[PDB]
């Protein structure tokens, strides 16, 4: 036990759990999931007196399924997850998931060519989660062709700008509740070009942040036992927060 000293004490024994996940998605233009996984980690910040033996339980009777695991070299073999945490802040585990993942957003691209002069683009996004949860830091990136002379854009929500030097329309929305949908409409004006090879369209890209594990993971409990000191599990104050953030999250179109 060279990761936790002997005489630690706090009146007000408190712990904070961070469940951090990025969800990666590659999706066809028709909505077929081409590829998807979640990698996550649990960070624990604990202020607990003595030498507490903790037990971390989650909804993974496998109720979600974990493909892989790494633990802080403080957790013990079996069965459940057992340990005496370092004081303060540390990483409890890294994990990976691929099954029955929740895709917070569904991106629906629509692209009509109009003569050789113009591209009409409509993109719809749908919040796929409880209506009482709020997503934020939503960003949709629509690539535009090299020979783009300019862009018109309308959107009833958020704000959108063409950035030429980046060749993308960037759409920003502050927050969006689950079970909603939003449109963006763009008209892309084209310069004459080499009629040979077409536009090899990069996928439409997305960023967002949601207050839940897209893997579906829930902390069932964290239990503290310190056989010696007056305090017990019920004296401990416990908090959790879930942040699911987009990793690579693209929809071909």
């Amino acid at each position: 036990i060279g990761w936790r000293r002997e005489g630690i004490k706090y009146r007000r024994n408190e712990l904070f759990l961070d469940v951090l996940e990025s969800v990666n998605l590659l999706m066809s233009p028709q909505g077929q999931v081409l590829s998807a996984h979640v990698s996550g980690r649990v960070v624990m910040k604990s202020y607990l007196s003595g030498m507490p033996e903790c037990k971390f339980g989650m909804n993974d009777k496998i109720s979600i399924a974990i493909d892989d695991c790494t633990f802080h070299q403080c957790v013990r073999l079996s069965r459940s997850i057992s340990f005496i945490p370092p004081d303060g802040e540390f990483e409890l585990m890294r994990y990976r998931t691929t099954k029955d993942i929740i895709l917070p957003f569904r991106v629906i691209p629509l692209v009509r060519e109009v003569g050789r002069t113009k591209l009409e683009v409509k993109v719809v996004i749908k919040s796929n989660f409880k209506p009482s949860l709020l997503a934020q830091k939503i960003e949709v990136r629509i690539p535009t062709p090299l020979n783009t002379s300019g862009v018109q854009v309308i959107c009833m929500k958020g704000k959108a700008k063409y950035k030429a030097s980046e060749n993308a329309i960037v759409w920003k929305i502050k927050r969006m509740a689950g079970m909603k949908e939003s449109q963006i409409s763009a008209e892309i004006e084209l310069l004459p070009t080499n009629d040979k090879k077409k536009w090899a369209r990069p996928p439409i890209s997305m960023n967002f942040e949601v207050p839940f594990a897209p893997s579906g993971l829930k902390v069932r409990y964290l239990k503290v036992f310190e056989p010696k000191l007056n305090y017990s599990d019920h004296d401990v104050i416990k908090w959790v927060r879930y942040i699911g953030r987009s990793g690579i999250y693209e929809t071909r179109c």
């Binding site: 904070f16 759990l17 961070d18 951090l20 942040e209 207050p211 902390v219 409990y221 964290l222 416990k238 908090w239 959790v240 927060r241 879930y242 942040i243």
Partner: peptide, 8 residues
């Protein structure tokens, strides 16, 4: 990243 909630 967000505001904490009671575990239970």
């Amino acid at each position: 990243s967000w505001v904490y909630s009671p575990l239970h």
